[PDB]
Design a protein around this motif. Structure first.
Motif, mmCIF file in Angstrom:
data_model
loop_
_atom_site.group_PDB
_atom_site.id
_atom_site.type_symbol
_atom_site.label_atom_id
_atom_site.label_comp_id
_atom_site.label_asym_id
_atom_site.label_seq_id
_atom_site.Cartn_x
_atom_site.Cartn_y
_atom_site.Cartn_z
ATOM 1 N N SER A 11 7.630 27.700 8.626
ATOM 2 C CA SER A 11 6.721 26.608 8.952
ATOM 3 C C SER A 11 6.513 25.685 7.749
ATOM 4 C CB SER A 11 5.393 27.160 9.453
ATOM 5 O OG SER A 11 5.579 27.884 10.656
ATOM 6 N N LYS A 12 5.264 25.408 7.386
ATOM 7 C CA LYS A 12 4.965 24.396 6.383
ATOM 8 C C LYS A 12 4.161 24.985 5.229
ATOM 9 C CE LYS A 12 1.880 20.965 6.712
ATOM 10 N NZ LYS A 12 1.365 20.793 5.318
ATOM 11 N N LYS A 13 4.460 24.509 4.025
ATOM 12 C CA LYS A 13 3.639 24.736 2.849
ATOM 13 C C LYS A 13 3.134 23.388 2.351
ATOM 14 C CE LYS A 13 6.981 26.807 0.657
ATOM 15 N NZ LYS A 13 7.754 27.442 -0.450
ATOM 16 N N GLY A 14 1.939 23.380 1.767
ATOM 17 C CA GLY A 14 1.351 22.130 1.324
ATOM 18 C C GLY A 14 1.570 21.833 -0.144
ATOM 19 N N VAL A 15 2.558 20.989 -0.443
ATOM 20 C CA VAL A 15 2.949 20.669 -1.811
ATOM 21 C C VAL A 15 2.798 19.170 -2.023
ATOM 22 C CG1 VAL A 15 4.812 20.695 -3.515
ATOM 23 C CG2 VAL A 15 4.521 22.637 -1.970
ATOM 24 N N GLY A 16 2.079 18.801 -3.077
ATOM 25 C CA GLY A 16 2.000 17.435 -3.555
ATOM 26 C C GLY A 16 1.850 17.488 -5.060
ATOM 27 N N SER A 17 1.646 16.327 -5.684
ATOM 28 C CA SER A 17 1.543 15.025 -5.035
ATOM 29 C C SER A 17 2.316 14.009 -5.835
ATOM 30 C CB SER A 17 0.097 14.589 -4.893
ATOM 31 O OG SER A 17 -0.567 15.457 -4.005
ATOM 32 N N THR A 18 2.066 12.736 -5.579
ATOM 33 C CA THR A 18 3.092 11.746 -5.845
ATOM 34 C C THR A 18 2.948 11.018 -7.171
ATOM 35 O OG1 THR A 18 1.839 10.101 -4.625
ATOM 36 C CG2 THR A 18 3.372 11.486 -3.419
ATOM 37 N N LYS A 19 1.741 10.914 -7.731
ATOM 38 C CA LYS A 19 1.445 10.448 -9.092
ATOM 39 C C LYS A 19 1.741 8.945 -9.319
ATOM 40 C CE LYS A 19 0.318 13.071 -11.854
ATOM 41 N NZ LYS A 19 1.112 13.790 -12.888
ATOM 42 N N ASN A 20 2.381 8.238 -8.378
ATOM 43 C CA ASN A 20 2.910 6.909 -8.669
ATOM 44 C C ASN A 20 2.571 5.845 -7.632
ATOM 45 O OD1 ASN A 20 4.232 7.736 -11.048
ATOM 46 N ND2 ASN A 20 5.963 8.501 -9.846
ATOM 47 N N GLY A 21 1.510 6.014 -6.845
ATOM 48 C CA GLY A 21 1.335 5.176 -5.667
ATOM 49 C C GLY A 21 0.824 3.770 -5.924
ATOM 50 N N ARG A 22 0.381 3.469 -7.134
ATOM 51 C CA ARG A 22 -0.410 2.266 -7.343
ATOM 52 C C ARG A 22 0.462 1.046 -7.646
ATOM 53 N NH1 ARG A 22 -0.713 6.207 -10.803
ATOM 54 N NH2 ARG A 22 0.087 5.821 -12.916
ATOM 55 N N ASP A 23 -0.120 -0.135 -7.409
ATOM 56 C CA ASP A 23 0.526 -1.435 -7.566
ATOM 57 C C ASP A 23 -0.553 -2.491 -7.754
ATOM 58 O OD1 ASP A 23 2.243 -3.644 -7.674
ATOM 59 O OD2 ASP A 23 2.961 -3.463 -5.619
ATOM 60 N N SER A 24 -0.224 -3.521 -8.530
ATOM 61 C CA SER A 24 -1.117 -4.638 -8.793
ATOM 62 C C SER A 24 -1.097 -5.636 -7.636
ATOM 63 C CB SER A 24 -0.708 -5.338 -10.079
ATOM 64 O OG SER A 24 0.554 -5.955 -9.915
ATOM 65 N N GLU A 25 -2.040 -6.581 -7.655
ATOM 66 C CA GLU A 25 -1.921 -7.739 -6.776
ATOM 67 C C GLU A 25 -0.824 -8.657 -7.278
ATOM 68 O OE1 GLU A 25 -5.432 -10.061 -6.187
ATOM 69 O OE2 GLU A 25 -6.392 -8.623 -4.855
ATOM 70 N N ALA A 26 0.038 -9.072 -6.362
ATOM 71 C CA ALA A 26 1.209 -9.865 -6.705
ATOM 72 C C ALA A 26 0.755 -11.271 -7.061
ATOM 73 C CB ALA A 26 2.198 -9.878 -5.546
ATOM 74 N N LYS A 27 0.821 -11.606 -8.342
ATOM 75 C CA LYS A 27 0.464 -12.935 -8.805
ATOM 76 C C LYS A 27 1.709 -13.792 -8.962
ATOM 77 C CE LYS A 27 -2.309 -11.566 -12.036
ATOM 78 N NZ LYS A 27 -2.615 -10.282 -11.363
ATOM 79 N N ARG A 28 1.630 -15.013 -8.460
ATOM 80 C CA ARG A 28 2.798 -15.800 -8.114
ATOM 81 C C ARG A 28 3.241 -16.674 -9.268
ATOM 82 N NH1 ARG A 28 0.576 -15.813 -3.035
ATOM 83 N NH2 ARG A 28 1.726 -14.432 -1.621
ATOM 84 N N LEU A 29 4.533 -16.977 -9.263
ATOM 85 C CA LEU A 29 5.176 -17.801 -10.268
ATOM 86 C C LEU A 29 6.141 -18.720 -9.537
ATOM 87 C CD1 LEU A 29 5.904 -15.112 -13.018
ATOM 88 C CD2 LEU A 29 4.092 -16.815 -13.031
ATOM 89 N N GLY A 30 7.035 -19.348 -10.284
ATOM 90 C CA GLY A 30 8.088 -20.142 -9.692
ATOM 91 C C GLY A 30 7.781 -21.626 -9.716
ATOM 92 N N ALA A 31 8.802 -22.402 -9.362
ATOM 93 C CA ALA A 31 8.727 -23.858 -9.402
ATOM 94 C C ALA A 31 7.860 -24.362 -8.263
ATOM 95 C CB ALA A 31 10.126 -24.458 -9.322
ATOM 96 N N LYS A 32 6.658 -24.829 -8.587
ATOM 97 C CA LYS A 32 5.779 -25.318 -7.540
ATOM 98 C C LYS A 32 6.192 -26.693 -7.047
ATOM 99 C CE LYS A 32 3.231 -21.710 -7.508
ATOM 100 N NZ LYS A 32 4.043 -20.910 -8.454
ATOM 101 N N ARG A 33 6.838 -27.493 -7.881
ATOM 102 C CA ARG A 33 7.431 -28.741 -7.432
ATOM 103 C C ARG A 33 8.934 -28.663 -7.637
ATOM 104 N NH1 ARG A 33 3.415 -30.046 -4.210
ATOM 105 N NH2 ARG A 33 1.495 -29.643 -5.385
ATOM 106 N N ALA A 34 9.609 -29.757 -7.354
ATOM 107 C CA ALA A 34 11.057 -29.782 -7.402
ATOM 108 C C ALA A 34 11.521 -30.742 -8.486
ATOM 109 C CB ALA A 34 11.642 -30.176 -6.049
#
Lengths: 120, 48, 82, 178, 138
Positions: free
Chosen positions: C1-24
RNA sequence: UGGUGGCGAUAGCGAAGAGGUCACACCCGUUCCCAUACCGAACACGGAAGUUAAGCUCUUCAGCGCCGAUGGUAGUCGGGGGUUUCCCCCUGUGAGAGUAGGACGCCGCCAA
RNA sequence: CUGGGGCGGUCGCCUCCUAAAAGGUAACGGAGGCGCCCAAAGGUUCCCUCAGAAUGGUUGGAAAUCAUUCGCAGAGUGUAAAGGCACAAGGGAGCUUGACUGCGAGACCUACAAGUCGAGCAGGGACGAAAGUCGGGCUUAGUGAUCCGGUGGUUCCGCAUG
RNA sequence: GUCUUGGAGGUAGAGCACUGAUUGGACUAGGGGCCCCUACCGGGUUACCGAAUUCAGUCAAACUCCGAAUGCCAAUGACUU
């Protein structure tokens, strides 16, 4: 053995950090000083054009001193070149310090320009 | 030890600011000078 | 059946702050509009562009937008008017 | 000016005639001497770094500069700040009285002084010189501190090769170990 | 039996193997080698299954080269556990093998020894092969 | 010939000569104006004894670094096929490296 | 939240990769960190440039310091990754408090709430000869609605009028 | 939308310009072995490991000196919608 920086060599590493501060012209051309060992010059230059607008130097057969390369009697060129662009009328100029200290008798060149009229 | 304390006026007695400062590193009654709009000039601002 | 093994240690992420050419390359652009968001100075400002607190590029006097090259591999934003 | 009038009269043309150069000014000289304590109180626990001030200013009245530790050390004391050893990088005309106090005055106050450093040049022209005693220099008082340090004195030449510099220092007359 | 000493990371992507290798499609140090023909992962143990079972047949032979090297940790979650919940234990090592890459080089050996000493290592390697010798131009 | 500029190291590192009256230089001194965690090395100042040595200019080199193709390939848009962890064509694009080669600079303004 | 649930672990903020050459773009995917610190580690004026290596030396040592070449950066840039930086945003002096009041044309991002950049004007400054820069730290983290109470100020209201 | 033209971005590929990982040879600072002596300074033997450095050659989502194909942002010339 001891390798030294020449007084012209590193001086243009001190001059370009003034060149990243001023625009050359603005109906106001830039104005540098060249302090040699013997006699000390002055040109009126402006980007973009690169046109030396009017100029003279302490080397000038007209209007000699004749002490030639000493205190503010050699800044008659600071008095002369401001009177020389005064007939051009232009302008309340931008002043380059070159790579030298604005100290005197390098300051005294640009001191002689101000009561010769030019506003800076 | 970092405590945010207002810097009140001396010409009028008016708080007007918040500054970060340290209790250990700056234990004195610290004083800068800033601009009081009710005093319209540069003004001696001690800590309070 | 199942055994309960964790865990993942790496789940986090920042809010994606944007870059790039805003005009052309060729935009009419009003005064003070953001040309190009940057982390640092990935591209330098030239004629009639300032530099923000976030080192961002934004045009002062209106007109076209040209992306250029310093030499050898270094770009430069300048704004030319009509 | 007794050393200064020595080479400004004879020594610089004497190397020209030994082997050539163009431009008679092209001759190595005495450039600069950097006296060092290097002490750091061994190891910062004295606490008097500044004891090395009184010990050093009477070699020559040049005000010294304590050399600050430019690195943190994991095996000893300490992190940066809290300076380690003093320094006078003397030049000029006070240079040419420091060396007259060396050769005929204080260098024989090295006890077993005969001649030294066959190989202590830095390869291309500097002359290194370690010093282990401090009753050596004349205006040091034996009534004073009575504590024992060491020194370096780094004589700097002008020559490209220490070939020309070692033969310069022998025209100066430097007693070497032969 | 080889392993990289200290890698920048312990758990890595699996990649997508396709096309011809970036280089080393030509035996050049020694004389004779095997060039692989398919794309595959080759584990650590199989180069250990090669450097042994060539020096069986190369009793007095030259140096055996290996131009392969393993750097990719093939990775297993511990068995009989559900999906997800972290990327698994680094199960060992695994090498990068494109097709066309000359695997071994063997020198100091004639033809007829190299057609069986190099053959029997190809029964251990999981990839179909072809024998490849050198060539001058050059 | 010096000063100041503009152009992507095709402008540069490196090797080698040659120049100094004038200019730029080193050089000489430190009472002054002003500097050093100290000090006339520097920074400031006034002077002209010595110098091509170094700087700087010109001239030769392609050892290095740089620029840089064409053709051909990797990759790939878009179809179409399959033996489908991948592979094959067709149309159009086309790298990277390498290479044929270029280049160890041009163009100003002022001053003698 | 969940590869049924429980137990484990995570809940929000900044950086990278996965991300498919704009920009976003998921999982119990792969790594780090963040709830601060600097009265100067801020602003400005003016200087200067690293790390490592070799050569030789004072107790000197594999290395503290000191000198001569190398050294386009292999150093630092508060704290951790990405970008960026020697003309410096990196180190050192001096003078300082702009770590500024009222703003704000206009933009970026986006459900909204939010958040970000700001040229320019006035008030008074700081540094600077001027030119001019200055609305905090090279950037991106270091912070949280409303209600409720308290403190300073209010040429505001005040329950017939004061 | 379609063609021209202008661009931003570092992907697929590649290659080593760095951050790493790595095959093999020269080079050998250091070390060990073995002896002499070391009561100590030290020396010789290495088909013994070996840092730099160098000749080639491999491989990277958290490596790029380089950099496509499309894709997005627009211009002004149209030719449709």
């Amino acid at each position: 053995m001891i390798t030294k920086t020449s007084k012209n060599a590193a001086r243009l590493k001190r001059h370009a950090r003034v060149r990243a501060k001023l625009s050359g012209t603005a109906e106001r051309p830039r104005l540098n000083v060249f302090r040699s060992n013997k006699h000390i010059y002055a040109q009126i230059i402006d980007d973009v054009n690169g046109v030396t607008l009017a100029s003279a130097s302490t080397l000038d057969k007209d209007l000699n001193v004749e002490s030639t390369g000493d205190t503010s009697a050699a800044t008659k060129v600071g008095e002369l070149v401001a009177k020389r662009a005064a007939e051009k009328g232009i302008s309340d100029v931008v002043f380059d310090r070159g790579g030298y200290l604005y100290h005197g008798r390098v300051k005294a060149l640009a001191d002689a320009a101000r009561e010769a009229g030019l506003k800076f | 030890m970092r405590v945010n304390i207002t810097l009140a006026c001396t010409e009028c007695g008016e708080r007007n600011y918040i500054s970060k400062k340290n209790k250990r590193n700056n234990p004195d009654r610290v004083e800068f000078k800033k601009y009081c709009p009710r005093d319209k000039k540069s003004t001696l601002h001690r800590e309070t | 059946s199942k055994k309960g093994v964790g865990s993942t240690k790496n789940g986090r992420d920042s809010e994606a702050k944007r870059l790039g050419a805003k005009r052309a390359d060729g935009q009419f652009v009003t005064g003070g509009s953001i040309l190009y968001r940057q982390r640092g100075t990935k591209i330098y400002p030239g004629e009639n562009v300032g530099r923000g607190g976030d080192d961002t590029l934004f045009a002062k006097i209106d007109g076209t937008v040209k992306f250029e090259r310093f030499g050898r591999d270094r770009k430069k934003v300048s704004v030319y008017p009509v | 000016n007794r050393l200064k009038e020595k080479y400004n009269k004879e020594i610089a043309p004497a190397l020209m005639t030994k082997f050539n150069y163009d431009s008679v000014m092209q001759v190595p000289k005495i450039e600069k001497i950097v006296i060092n304590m290097g002490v750091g109180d061994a190891v910062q626990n004295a606490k008097a770094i500044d004891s090395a001030v009184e010990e050093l200013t009477f070699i020559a009245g040049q005000k010294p500069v304590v050399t600050r530790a430019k690195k943190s050390i994991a095996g000893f004391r300490l992190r940066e700040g809290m300076p380690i050893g003093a320094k006078v990088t003397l030049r000029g005309e006070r240079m040419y009285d420091f060396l007259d106090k060396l050769i005929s005055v204080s260098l024989p106050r090295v006890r077993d002084f005969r001649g030294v450093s066959k190989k202590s040049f830095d390869g291309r022209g500097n002359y290194t010189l370690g010093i282990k005693e401090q009753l050596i220099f004349p205006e040091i008082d034996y009534d004073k501190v009575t504590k024992v340090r060491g020194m370096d004195i780094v004589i700097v030449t002008t020559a490209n090769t220490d070939e020309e510099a070692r033969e310069l220092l022998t025209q100066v007359g430097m007693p070497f170990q032969k | 039996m080889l392993l990289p000493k200290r890698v920048k990371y312990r758990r890595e992507h699996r990649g997508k193997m396709r096309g011809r290798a970036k280089g080393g499609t030509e035996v050049h140090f020694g004389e004779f080698g095997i060039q692989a023909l398919e794309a595959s992962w080759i584990t650590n143990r199989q180069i250990e299954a090669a450097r042994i079972a060539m020096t069986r047949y190369m009793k007095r032979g030259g140096k055996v080269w290996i131009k392969i090297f393993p750097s990719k940790p093939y990775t297993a979650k511990p068995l009989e556990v559900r999906m997800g919940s972290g990327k698994g234990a680094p199960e060992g090592w695994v090498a990068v093998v494109k097709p066309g890459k000359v695997l071994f080089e063997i020198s100091g050996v004639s033809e007829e020894v190299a057609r069986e000493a190099l053959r029997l290592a190809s029964h251990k390697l999981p990839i179909k092969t072809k024998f490849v010798k050198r060539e001058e131009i050059g």
